[PDB]
């Protein structure tokens, strides 16, 4: 079996938010529901990471490190994909029962949070990203940041990361494809990968603010609260190296 076919079979099942559409909407209600959904998506992301070939060979501390650094990148990218596949309209499809439409976008402070996530879906649409490219790109996002002083299994990590870069290359070549157009496409997809650091920076600013300001009464489930608590000191101590394809 090919490497991309193994990434495909471990794709998590779509989760429902359990959002009651008969009750009126509010920004607070949507944010709260999404944090609970995020916690369940993150538990499924751990099971997913464990089945990625090579991931389990890294030191356990590195496995934890990579999931903690990349969690928001993984969530926003998968959301970008679901939004891109559902429609060609400017919609965020968090779950099949929780889609942020134009009427929902008009709720106080909905748009300023949603614009960074809408950028991901609009880019996947503009670049006409394939399912195989997507699968390779999402695994690369798990491998997109490391500690300032590196991982315990740094050498093995670099080898695994290079393998998934070559795997993204193989997905691009399937369309079908011109040598010059291949390098152009590789450049474009890696540029989108790089821009995920900027999308995530913007999303974490809202995430960290709503987690820390207890007077906002915005709840996060245990899975997300634990990751956020771990990550906030790492950002304040500059303990992060954001890997880039383009300098």
């Amino acid at each position: 079996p090919t490497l991309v076919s193994l990434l495909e079979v471990i794709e998590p099942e779509v989760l429902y938010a359990g959002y009651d559409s008969s009750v009126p909407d509010s920004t607070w209600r949507i944010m709260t529901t999404l944090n609970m959904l995020g916690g369940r998506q993150m538990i499924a992301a751990v099971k997913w990471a464990k089945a990625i070939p090579g991931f389990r060979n890294l030191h356990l501390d590195d496995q934890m490190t990579l999931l903690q650094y990349s969690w928001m990148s993984l969530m926003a990218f998968a959301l970008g994909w679901r939004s891109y596949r559902q429609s060609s309209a400017n919609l965020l499809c968090f779950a099949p029962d929780l889609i942020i439409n134009e009427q929902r976008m008009t709720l106080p402070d909905m748009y300023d949070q949603c614009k960074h996530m809408l950028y991901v879906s609009s880019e996947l649409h503009r670049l006409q990203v394939s399912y195989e490219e997507y699968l390779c790109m999402k695994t690369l996002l798990l491998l997109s940041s490391v500690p300032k002083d590196g991982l315990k299994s740094q050498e093995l990590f670099d080898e695994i990361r290079m393998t998934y870069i070559k795997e993204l290359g193989k997905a691009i070549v399937k369309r079908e494809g011109n040598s010059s157009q291949n390098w152009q496409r590789f450049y474009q997809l890696t540029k989108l990968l790089d821009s995920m650091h900027e999308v995530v920076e913007n999303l974490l600013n809202y995430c960290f603010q709503t987690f820390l300001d207890k007077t906002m009464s915005i709840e996060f489930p245990e899975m997300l609260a634990e990751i956020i608590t771990n990550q906030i000191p790492k950002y304040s101590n500059g303990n992060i190296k954001k890997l880039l394809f383009h300098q």
Binding site: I43, V46, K47, K50, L60, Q63, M64, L67, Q68, E222, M223, E226, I227, N230
Partner: peptide
């Protein structure tokens, strides 16, 4: 401590 994450990584599945 990251109790939940370590548990999910160490448990079977």
């Amino acid at each position: 401590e990251n109790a939940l994450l370590r548990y999910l990584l160490d448990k079977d599945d």
